[PDB]
């Protein structure tokens, strides 16, 4: 297994499919997955400074990396905050680990959601970059059902080299992304 | 365990554990077990994958899923409220639909005992 399953199949099948669907007229112009940024949506800070460790541990065993925390970029008055408090932890997967996480997700997590209907393809920005979110918690089978105390969803954004939302949609369709129209 | 989207109790009989589903209860689970050929005195810690799958497909074939029943109740309620009938008026006003006492009773539907 020199390359992950997703990388191996994308090297030929998805590449040829995209080249046949959109005539780029030159190699190196085919859209490809650049990175996958997964962020743990938090903000309960200023009332409990312990759940951040649980969020970090959840990001762990879900991504094969050590998530880092992003501190408050500005103190807000309405919402209890403070400049320098750790608000949210993210991981930036890229390469073999990125492909592994992507395929494991597409294979286990998405079909594991309760009352799963699919994913909307309209969640595409103006640069062919996809973004979605896991709602409550425990979509992957790496975390025990009882080892979790409270639900802590996350937001996953796949940044690819798709100059157009249509190109990104085609790339994800060639991939194992279930979409509903 | 994971059956249709809900988790069952830890240490309980099957006929009481299957009550967690929005479309299965004591007698419904008893009938399902009698039709599938499974005992009811078994605990909720010795289940098999084959039995899980067979029960899932049996309930999906005979009855419908918990989410199906939930959104069906929601759709029927909103439809009978939109048609503009007595049931819809009572549902909009937070009053009983079956036409019972409303002078002092009906708190179960009107919410907590409020006085203004």
């Amino acid at each position: 297994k020199a390359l992950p399953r997703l990388k191996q199949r994308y090297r030929e099948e998805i590449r040829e499919a995209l080249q046949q669907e959109f005539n780029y007229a030159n190699v190196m112009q085919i859209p490809g997955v650049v990175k996958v940024v997964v962020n743990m949506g938090v903000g309960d800070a200023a009332r409990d400074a312990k759940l951040i460790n649980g969020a970090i541990n959840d990001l762990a065993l879900i991504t094969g990396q050590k998530p880092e925390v992003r501190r408050a970029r500005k103190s807000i008055a309405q919402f209890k905050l403070r400049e320098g408090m750790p608000i949210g932890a993210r991981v930036t997967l890229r390469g073999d680990r990125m492909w592994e996480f992507l395929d494991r997700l597409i294979s286990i997590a998405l079909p594991r959601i309760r009352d799963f209907r699919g994913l909307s393809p309209k969640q595409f920005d103006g640069t062919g970059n996809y973004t979605f979110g896991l709602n409550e918690q425990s979509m992957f089978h790496e975390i025990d059902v009882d080892s979790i105390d409270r639900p802590r969803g996350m937001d996953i954004t796949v940044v690819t080299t798709a100059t157009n939302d249509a190109e990104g949609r085609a790339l994800l369709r060639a991939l194992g992304f279930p979409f509903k129209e | 365990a994971r059956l249709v989207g809900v988790d069952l109790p830890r240490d309980k009989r099957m006929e009481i554990a299957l009550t967690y589903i929005y479309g299965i209860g004591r007698t419904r689970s008893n009938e399902i077990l009698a039709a599938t050929g499974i005992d009811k005195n078994m605990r909720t810690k010795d289940l098999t994958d084959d039995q899980v799958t067979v029960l899932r497909d049996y309930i999906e074939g005979n009855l419908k899923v918990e989410g199906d029943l939930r959104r069906e109740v929601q759709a029927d309620i909103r439809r009978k409220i939109e048609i503009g009938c007595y049931q819809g008026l009572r549902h909009r006003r937070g009053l009983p639909v079956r036409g019972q006492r409303t002078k002092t009773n009906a708190r179960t539907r009107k919410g907590p005992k409020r006085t203004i």
């Binding site: 992950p4 399953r5 762990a60 065993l61 094969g64 990396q65 050590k66 592994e100 395929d103 494991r104 597409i106 294979s107 286990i108 079909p111 594991r112 009352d115 799963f116 209907r117 699919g118 089978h141 790496e142 194992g176 279930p178 | 994971r2 994958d49 084959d50 899980v52 799958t53 999906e60 419908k64 899923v65 989410g67 199906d68 029943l69 959104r71 069906e72 759709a75 029927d76 439809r79 009978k80």
Partner: protein, 66 residues
């Protein structure tokens, strides 16, 4: 990547009741994951069931028969 700030990473095989076999790196040391759902979406039929369950006119018809 650093020395040991991450947990173990080993290959694991995932099975299903329908015989679907998957293989991918994960944290499970057992290397075997018996799951009730894999890349074969029963939601595909669960959604059509959610939709077909609708219909109040048919319920009126049947339970009236009056």
């Amino acid at each position: 990547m650093k020395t040991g700030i991450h947990p173990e990473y080993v290959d694991t095989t995932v099975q299903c009741g329908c015989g679907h076999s998957f293989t991918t790196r994960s944290t499970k040391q057992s290397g075997t994951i018996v799951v009730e759902v894999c890349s074969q979406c029963h939601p595909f039929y669960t959604g059509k069931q959610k939709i077909l369950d609708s219909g109040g006119r048919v319920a009126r018809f049947e339970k009236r028969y009056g």
